[PDB]
Amino acid sequence: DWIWNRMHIREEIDSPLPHHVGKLTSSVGNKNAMYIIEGESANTIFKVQGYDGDIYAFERLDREKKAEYELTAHIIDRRNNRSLEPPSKFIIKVSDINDNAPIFVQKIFNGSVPEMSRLGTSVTKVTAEDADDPTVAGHATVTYQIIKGNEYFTVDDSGVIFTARADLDRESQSAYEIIVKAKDALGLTGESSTATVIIRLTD
Amino acid sequence: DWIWNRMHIREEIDSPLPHHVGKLTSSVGNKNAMYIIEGESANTIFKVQGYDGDIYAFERLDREKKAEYELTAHIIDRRNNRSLEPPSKFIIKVSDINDNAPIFVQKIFNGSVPEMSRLGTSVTKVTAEDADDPTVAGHATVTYQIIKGNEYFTVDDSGVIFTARADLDRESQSAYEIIVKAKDALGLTGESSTATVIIRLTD
Ligand SMILES: [Ca+2]
Ligand SMILES: [Ca+2]
Numbered sequence A, B: 001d002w003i004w005n006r007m008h009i010r011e012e013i014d015s016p017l018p019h020h021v022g023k024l025t026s027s028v029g030n031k032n033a034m035y036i037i038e039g040e041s042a043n044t045i046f047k048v049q050g051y052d053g054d055i056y057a058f059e060r061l062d063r064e065k066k067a068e069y070e071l072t073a074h075i076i077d078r079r080n081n082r083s084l085e086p087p088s089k090f091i092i093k094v095s096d097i098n099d100n101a102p103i104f105v106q107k108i109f110n111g112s113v114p115e116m117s118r119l120g121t122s123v124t125k126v127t128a129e130d131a132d133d134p135t136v137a138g139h140a141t142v143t144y145q146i147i148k149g150n151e152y153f154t155v156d157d158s159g160v161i162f163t164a165r166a167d168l169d170r171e172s173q174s175a176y177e178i179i180v181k182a183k184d185a186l187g188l189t190g191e192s193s194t195a196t197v198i199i200r201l202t203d
């Protein structure tokens, strides 16, 4: 279905308040009429600025705090306070910007793998989460790199760590401490965007 | 009735092209669908910019040239070119700015009034035309001032000229030339802003 009862405003707008959100339109043509709103942050963050039905935002918004607001519109005869229309529900949607980097879910991950496993043996999985909107182009798309120990292990872009060599010998080294870094597809990183993986070689 | 199938963009936008108009929303689905538009200046002035159904304008607009544009939106599966919704009609409205001053096309008006008429006697009506939108915030509200001949006549903000004295005497002076200035209520005046009124006393 087509969804038309929506307004959209970008988060984190850094030009001077207030900021234009969108415009209400009722077909009545009583010019004693006024647009009135109620609902989530109606008349605090979002205010009508008239007489045309324009709604403005009076705070900078963070989609990661609240991503949308449910409001209801009216239109009122200011002579007699009569409601001229049925009220109309709508949503003000806060449009995502890429303002978060992926952050690992743990400071230290642990795994193990038998010594002398074939090249490309899966060891363990690391995970970083990006607080941006995962339905927007790439904003919460996470990619991974090993930045210390990449000669010994590789990582795929799901965070899966694999042996990078077929000759890992427990006698030479029984525990690797490797450093992983995460970074969203638009390049945003990072700290808490690194972590450590302790990988023990088993006998 | 509430009219939700609308977008609005201000005319005579001075910042870098291109300029955000609004956003289409289908509750569909893919994951493989694309927003496609047709209609007045679709795909030349107005283009979808992807992938969330945002429309942008690629020219500056003049409401006085064209005030609105009828378009139809589609949502199409990229794979097989199947439509995924019935099309939806919508209008892109161009929001007025105050960029026109009242213009006198007729620059000489003629009126008459009996000599020795009382103060406040109606003489004639002058009219200047303002090309902006009469439904928006004073933009085409015309006001008038007398800038020559104030001692003898007044003008109201509807352009009606009145006697300013009860002793206008046909034997002493049978004809006056006053000059009227028009400007809109927001102060905009320009090159065609004055007219002469030739007033003759009768009896
Ligand atoms: Ca944010
Ligand atoms: Ca991100």
Ligand SMILES: [Ca+2]
Pocket: A011, A063, A064, A096, A097, A098, A099, A100, A131, A132, A133
């Ligand atoms: Ca964000």
Ligand SMILES: [Ca+2]
Pocket: B011, B012, B061, B062, B063, B064, B065, B099
């Ligand atoms: Ca214009």
Ligand SMILES: [Ca+2]
Pocket: B011, B063, B064, B096, B097, B098, B099, B100, B131, B132, B133
């Ligand atoms: Ca205009």
Ligand SMILES: [Ca+2]
Pocket: B098, B099, B100, B101, B102, B130, B131, B132, B139, B140, B141, B184, B188
């Ligand atoms: Ca004007």
